[PDB]
């Protein structure tokens, strides 16, 4: 009988909602209202990068805070050198359709994927000196949306098959698979300790997965549309979610509920990229209205705009040192803001 | 130290990028869309994951893609196809049960925010079966306003009313709201499709170039 299970679902949902409502004694904004504002944040572009033919979907900084890699829709993967604007490697892809990229923690390897349902791993430190394809991970059904390295032997991927998987680069087989979502999985992010990770789906739902166990520990709801971006607070006990209803939200793991909502009456466009700062005080969000915004993470007040792009902003990243910001767009232009 | 080597490497890579830019700009890309029952496989295999096919007409290179390995939800991976030259849209004219779904898909593609510049080339396949079905199920069952329609084929004039009524709905949706539509009547056994695609792409590019010089 499906009816009894459907009912048990709603009594359990009511119990969870009652517990969440009883647990909410106060609000974060009321406590944080006592601190002084940070004022106006004004950044100027310091570097611009050219060379791509088509739009840009993904990018990734290096752990040394000097190099980065970008993937473009014309079938190209270019590694830059942001200090002197020179560029070191240019790799042509097998398929022109690419949606994601990653850069290894040790800098030895790079990864890419897209509509071809195949994850490609490229070697940067070959004895000959050129870049050569090393491994093709296959087994997914839908397109790959995100991929992140754990070490030089493991990698976690999320597909449009409504699933996530953990691979073994040496053998190329899935050690563990994570299932439970209803729609497409859009993005993921690794914890600072690389022990747990969160994943957001097109069902307006986020989930917290454990890498070693393989089970879903807890889930978060509260949005009204598809979720496009997600990232951890640098402490590792909270994260921020951006959706297509033109609102950002802040969740915490321990309270298992929502803390703040970042929204305005002037915005009717969704968010495509979300990132934090080194100290966690600023939240950078990219929109479809060709601009970006900097929210005060403890006051929900906008403190600046980044209006240097004349098209949609797709990727946004912050260096590990918290000293520069990189913002891509559909113009085939990369911009560095300081 | 390494700055000279980096400058040499940058020059070497930029030469290859300049070489590849022309090859990228030479060819014309197309996206093929249709239903399961539609004979779009025959269309794409007549001139011969994601399946690509290449054909050359009058020393011009076309490259068209068919995506069939994904699921049935397409609101997310369609945004990648906002830079294609044209969208080929294959519709069966012999199935009255599933015509409303094709109409709704055409409307959704027409009104999409990221596809307000891409043009649609419409193919109405399966005319031979439509003629036999009409000459011998009645189309008035699924469309009341067909009782009040007047024509604007050669073997019988009763087929013309239906085969133009089916096209008038798509034309009405197209004209109800930059980009145009190009209807065509085609069968399964027909070799004129490549020339039609060539002419439609030529017209689209000519209009774009005319707008570039501000003659329109």
């Amino acid at each position, epitope marked *: 009988e499906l009816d009894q299970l459907r009912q048990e679902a709603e009594q359990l949902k009511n119990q969870i909602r009652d517990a969440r409502k009883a647990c909410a004694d106060a609000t974060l904004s009321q406590i944080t209202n006592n601190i002084d504002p940070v004022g106006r944040i004004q950044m100027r572009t310091r570097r611009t990068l050219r060379g791509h033919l088509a739009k840009i979907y993904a990018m990734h900084w290096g752990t040394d805070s000097r190099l980065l890699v970008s993937a473009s829709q014309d079938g190209k993967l270019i590694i830059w050198d942001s200090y002197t604007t020179n560029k070191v490697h240019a790799i042509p892809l097998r398929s022109s359709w690419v949606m994601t990229c990653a850069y290894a923690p040790s800098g030895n390897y790079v990864a890419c994927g897209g509509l071809d349902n195949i994850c490609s791993i490229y070697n940067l430190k070959t004895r000959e000196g050129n870049v050569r394809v090393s491994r093709e991970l296959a087994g997914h059904t839908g397109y790959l949306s995100c991929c992140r390295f754990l070490d030089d032997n493991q990698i976690v991927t999320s597909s449009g098959d409504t699933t996530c998987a953990l691979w073994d680069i040496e053998t190329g087989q899935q050690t563990t698979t994570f299932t439970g979502h209803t*729609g497409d999985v859009m993005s993921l992010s690794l914890a600072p300790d690389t022990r747990l990770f969160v994943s957001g789906a097109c069902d307006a739902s986020a989930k917290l997965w454990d890498v070693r166990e393989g089970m879903c520990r807890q889930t978060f709801t509260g949005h009204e549309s598809d979720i496009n971006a997600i990232c951890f607070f640098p402490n590792g006990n909270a994260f921020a979610t951006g959706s297509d209803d033109a609102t950002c939200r802040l969740f915490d793991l321990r309270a298992d509920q929502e803390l703040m909502t970042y929204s305005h009456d002037n915005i*009717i466009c969704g968010i495509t990229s979300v990132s934090f700062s080194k100290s966690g005080r600023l939240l950078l969000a990219g929109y479809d209205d060709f601009n970006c915004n900097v929210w005060d993470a403890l006051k929900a007040d906008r403190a600046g705009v980044l209006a240097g792009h004349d098209n949609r902003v797709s990727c946004l990243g912050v260096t590990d040192d918290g000293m520069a910001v990189a913002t891509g767009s559909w113009d085939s232009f990369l911009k560095i803001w300081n | 130290n390494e700055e000279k080597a980096q400058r040499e490497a940058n020059k070497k890579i930029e030469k290859q990028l300049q070489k590849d830019k022309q090859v990228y700009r030479a060819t014309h890309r197309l996206l093929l869309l249709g239903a399961d029952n539609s004979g779009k496989s025959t269309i794409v295999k007549q001139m011969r994951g994601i399946f690509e096919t290449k054909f050359q007409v009058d020393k011009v290179n076309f490259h068209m893609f068919d995506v069939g390995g994904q699921r049935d*939800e397409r609101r997310k991976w369609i945004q990648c196809f906002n830079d294609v030259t044209a969208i080929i849209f294959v519709v069966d004219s012999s199935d009255y049960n599933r015509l409303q779904e094709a109409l709704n898909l055409f409307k959704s593609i027409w009104n999409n925010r990221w596809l307000r510049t891409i043009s649609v080339i419409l193919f109405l396949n399966k005319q031979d079966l439509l003629a036999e079905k009409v000459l011998a199920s009645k189309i008035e069952d*699924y469309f009341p306003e067909f009782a009040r329609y007047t024509t604007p084929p050669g073997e019988d004039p009763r087929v013309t009313r239906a085969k133009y009524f089916i096209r008038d709905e798509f034309l009405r949706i197209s004209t109800a709201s930059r980009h145009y539509c190009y209807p065509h009547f085609t069968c399964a056994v027909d070799t004129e499709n490549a020339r039609r695609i060539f002419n439609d792409c030529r017209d689209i590019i000519q209009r774009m170039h005319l707008r570039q010089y501000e003659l329109l």
Partner: nanobody, 126 residues
Framework: QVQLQESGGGLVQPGGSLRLSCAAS????????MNWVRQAPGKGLEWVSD????????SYTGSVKGRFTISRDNAKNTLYLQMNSLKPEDTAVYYCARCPAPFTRDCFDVTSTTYAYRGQGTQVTV
């Protein structure tokens, strides 16, 4: 969380009248365009009718024009459907759908087999 409950279906003789009512919770009503879909036994999902944000423009399918009417109520956050003179081929299960994104006049993947924003529906027999 988006939540949708449908009600009002039941047994009816041919030529009768029927009311279907849907209640929505968890989102703002007036920012979305609303859809009704139906599924007959041994058949796929079939689109019936839809209504825009404010109700200015409504659209119908071919086989129910002149017999069904659709309306929305933003104050009570509800949707309605009227059935008159039911044909024997109208027995099916009815769902109320929702536009995936606000401030849009297009709808993708509304009749898919695994859509997320839709109700459980009600059974209507003739």
């Amino acid at each position: 969380q988006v939540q949708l409950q449908e009600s009002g279906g039941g047994l009816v003789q041919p030529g009768g009248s029927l009311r279907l009512s849907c209640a929505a919770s968890g989102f703002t009503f007036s920012n979305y365009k609303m859809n009704w879909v139906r599924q007959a036994p041994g058949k796929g999902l079939e689109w019936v009718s839809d209504i825009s944000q404010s109700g200015a423009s409504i659209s119908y399918t071919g086989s129910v024009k002149g017999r069904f009417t659709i309306s929305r109520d933003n104050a009570k956050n509800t949707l309605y459907l009227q059935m008159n003179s039911l044909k024997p081929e109208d027995t099916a299960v009815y769902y109320c759908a929702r536009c995936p994104a606000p401030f849009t006049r297009d709808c993708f993947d509304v009749t898919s087999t695994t859509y997320a924003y839709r109700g459980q529906g009600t059974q209507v027999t003739v």
